[PDB]
Amino acid sequence: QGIQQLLQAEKRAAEKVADARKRKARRLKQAKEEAQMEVDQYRREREQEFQSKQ
């Protein structure tokens, strides 16, 4: 009947809010370390300006 299928299909919409947190969970977490991947842009800056010191 119509009233019981409405709630389980609401759980389908309540499963896409778990994706609305997930695509700001993984994307927050993966490129937080890509911001820490710019330490390697500093590690080339120190070692190439190690030459100007040398």
Next chain:
Amino acid sequence: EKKEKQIEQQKKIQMSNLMNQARLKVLRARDDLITDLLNEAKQRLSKVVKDTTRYQ
């Protein structure tokens, strides 16, 4: 900016001390031309001591 600013400053201190001892070496090498001149003059007073008709 703590890696490049010290190595230019320590370059300046190294250039300062080398320029100063470039002046202090040539000035100490100015004495030994004067000190031996007073030593060579001190030798030649003793030759004046020898000849008595000039020494008396």
